[PDB]
Design a binder for this molecule. Structure first.
Ligand SMILES: O=C(NO)c1coc(-c2ccc(Br)cc2)n1
Ligand SMILES: [K+]
Ligand SMILES: [K+]
Ligand SMILES: [Zn+2]
Length: 354
């Protein structure tokens, strides 16, 4: 089977001109890409071309007002760029930000297209800026457009409306935008694992707690796995996958799996404060490959330790390529509490839960 890879160095143009050291660095993606070359993973992949998303494709998830204001930043002066970005929560904008976000989205669209048309079995998308905090009508948390959400809708747009898409968000932060975009949607199952700390961790909303299970026809199709009081690592993530992610995913039976694959839960990351190892990410990837006839697209989200994310994402690509999972302790009490709270909330909706 063939593994696709998409990477375009033009996504490095998006930058913070008032803090050249801001953690969401252009070098995030070049470091990951270089490590794929060093480890001889890139040469094993089918190279998928990048492309710009169109404005009509952005409209699958975003309002015209939001597309209009971000598009207008392409021709702003530095003072106007600073003012606009300070209007959002945790955003910086450069004149290249809009086109880079278009490239991140269209790269993932081409990757989803390649998977669904059978050109490759699975794929990895080394892209920035990230997507999962972006709402229908707002930029937030380094994200302008919700790449993962857009890719789900794009995939349905080129197959059928009811194509079942699982989005597993293992970025350490809650993907508030992805949850809200699909909150009332039973065609897109959103499962997020995130540091929560009783609502006092970015993006700082109780919308991320385990009891937000969806709305309307979407009740049960939104699974939040919030972590509290603990430096969670491989044992907690493996246990969450065993008890929640994989049983629910199997009952949903997705046809396409997208991973909002932040690597800010990795050890070494100062923004996430967790200790998930590269081998841990390999095991999570390997479990997801058992779904959707292997149709898995790994999409970079957050992740800010340049070595950690390069090592971690490389391990995921190795798994997609078919390499054997690498070698990989009981849980903390609060992790057990978190998993039991999700199990109780979702027992009405998922009969396979135990
Ligand atoms: O990686 C992220 N999401 O996946 C992400 C987005 O914004 C932030 C953040 C912003 C300000 C401060 Br202070 C701390 C964290 N992190
Ligand atoms: K998450
Ligand atoms: K949903
Ligand atoms: Zn994050």
């Amino acid at each position: 089977p063939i593994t696709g890879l998409v990477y375009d160095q033009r996504m490095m143009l998006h930058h913070n001109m008032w803090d050249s050291h801001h953690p969401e660095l252009p070098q995030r993606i070049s470091r990951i890409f270089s490590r794929h070359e060093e480890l001889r993973l890139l040469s094993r992949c089918h190279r998928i071309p990048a492309r710009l998303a169109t404005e009509e494709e952005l409209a699958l998830c975003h309002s015209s007002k939001h597309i209009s204001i971000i598009k207008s930043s392409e021709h702003m002066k530095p003072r106007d760029l600073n003012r606009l970005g300070d209007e959002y929560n945790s955003i910086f904008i450069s004149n290249e930000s809009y086109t880079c976000a278009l490239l991140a989205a269209g790269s993932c669209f081409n990757s989803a297209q390649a998977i669904l048309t059978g050109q490759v079995r699975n794929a990895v998308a080394i892209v920035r800026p990230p997507g999962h905090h972006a709402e229908k009508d707002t930029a937030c948390g380094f994200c302008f457009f919700n790449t993962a959400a857009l890719t789900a809708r794009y995939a349905q747009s080129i197959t059928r409306e009811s194509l079942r898409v699982l989005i597993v968000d293992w970025d350490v932060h809650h993907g508030n935008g992805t949850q809200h975009i699909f909150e009332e949607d039973d065609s897109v199952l959103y499962i997020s694992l995130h540091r929560y700390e009783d609502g006092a961790f970015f993006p700082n909303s109780e919308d991320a707690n385990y009891d937000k299970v969806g709305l309307g026809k979407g009740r049960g199709y939104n699974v939040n796995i919030p972590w509290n009081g603990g430096k969670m690592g491989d044992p907690e993530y493996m246990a969450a996958f065993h008890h929640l992610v994989m049983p629910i995913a199997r009952e949903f039976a997705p046809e396409l799996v997208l991973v909002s694959a932040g690597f800010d839960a990795a050890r070494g990351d100062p923004l996430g404060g967790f200790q998930v190892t590269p081998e841990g990410y390999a095991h999570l990837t390997h479990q997801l490959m058992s779904l959707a006839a292997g149709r898995v697209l790994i999409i970079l989200e957050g992740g800010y330790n340049l070595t950690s994310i390069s090592e971690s994402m490389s391990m995921c690509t190795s798994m997609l390529l078919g390499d054997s999972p690498p070698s990989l302790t009981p849980l903390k009490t609060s992790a057990t509490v978190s998993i039991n709270n999700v199990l109780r909330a979702h027992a009405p909706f998922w009969s396979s839960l135990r």
